[PDB]
């Protein structure tokens, strides 16, 4: 079946740089998108942005267009984040998930890497 | 409910380190609103008191909290008596768990 | 772009008490809302697809609305329905949400 699994540095700078992987598994990586979530230490979701690999179309929300960088591997079944330029407001818990019949929606969860700057 | 209010004296290995920790827990009370007093040989302290309130537990919907208050060996050698008390709204009488460091 | 106002903030629930959880859309969006439910240490758990559709296993007591209303039925609260619960729109891509938090008297 399906099964997402995330491992981040975890542990960061401010002002340096880091990437995020996402390995997708049970599914044809290349047929639905996916989307990036990130959740504050007792907070609320808040979307970042969206890949679809088929032919690695990006589209992001305006508050994350540079710290986010969206990026994704045909050959690997790997999605990719890399949040660059990190100050203390990116410490959280970021989530890579696809939906199982809606592609927006999110059907299917990853473990999620908590990140602290 | 009413909490279940448990005091616990700093371990051997740190009063050995050069510090003293007492450790408050507060378990199975609701509603969420309660809060945690400390005395030393009776007199509120609330500087190196750190709280943390769980949320709501999955089982049986009640909250539990732990309240830790951070002190030197000297500063902890150098009073005797610590009270934990817990204001909630199941009774007027703040629940009180005190020990002495004596015995 | 498109804005999901949630309502209540908190609500506290009596074990076995219907409830709705309203989610307030800006822009029409036909249906394409979807519910989900976050606990403790938890990520968010997809409970009904769509505007009205049953997924997996998740109890039989949700799902209700269209257009620029929602609701969020839950039929008979149980202990284990503690939580937040988040709506989300997948019309725009903005992919904005909401919150309410469930508690239990």
């Known amino acids: 079946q399906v099964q997402l699994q995330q491992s981040g540095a975890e542990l960061a700078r401010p002002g340096t740089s880091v990437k995020l992987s996402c390995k997708a598994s049970?599914?044809?990586?290349?047929?639905?998108?996916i989307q990036w979530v990130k959740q504050r230490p007792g907070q609320g979701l808040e979307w970042i942005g969206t890949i679809y690999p088929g032919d690695g179309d990006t589209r992001y929300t305006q508050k994350f267009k540079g710290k986010a960088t969206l990026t994704a591997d045909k050959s690997s079944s790997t999605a990719y984040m890399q949040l660059i330029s990190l100050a203390s407001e990116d410490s959280a818990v970021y989530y890579c998930?696809?939906?199982?019949?809606?592609?927006?929606?999110?059907?299917?969860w990853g473990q999620g890497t908590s990140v602290t700057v | 409910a009413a909490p279940t209010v448990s005091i616990f004296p700093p371990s051997s290995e740190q009063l050995t380190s050069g510090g003293a920790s007492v450790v408050c827990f507060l378990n199975n009370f609701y509603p969420k609103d309660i809060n945690v007093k400390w005395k030393i040989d009776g007199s509120e302290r609330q500087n190196g008191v750190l709280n943390s309130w769980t949320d709501q537990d999955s089982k049986d919907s009640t909250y539990s909290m732990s309240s830790t208050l951070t002190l030197t060996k000297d500063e902890y050698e150098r009073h005797n008596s610590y009270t934990c008390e817990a204001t909630h709204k199941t009774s007027t009488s703040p629940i009180v768990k005190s020990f002495n460091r004596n015995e | 772009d498109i804005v999901l106002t949630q309502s209540p903030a908190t609500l506290s629930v009596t074990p076995g008490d219907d409830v709705s959880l309203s989610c307030r859309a800006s822009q029409s969006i036909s249906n394409n809302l979807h519910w989900y439910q976050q606990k403790s240490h938890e990520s968010p758990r997809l409970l009904i697809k769509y505007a009205s559709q049953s997924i997996s296993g998740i109890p039989s007591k949700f799902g209700r609305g269209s257009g620029t209303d929602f609701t969020l039925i839950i039929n008979r609260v149980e202990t284990e329905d503690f939580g937040v619960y988040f709506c989300q729109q997948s019309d725009s891509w903005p992919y904005t949400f909401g919150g309410t938090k469930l508690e239990i008297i």
């Open positions: 998930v696809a939906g199982y019949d809606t592609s927006g929606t999110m059907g299917y």
């Open positions: 049970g599914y044809t990586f290349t047929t639905y998108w």
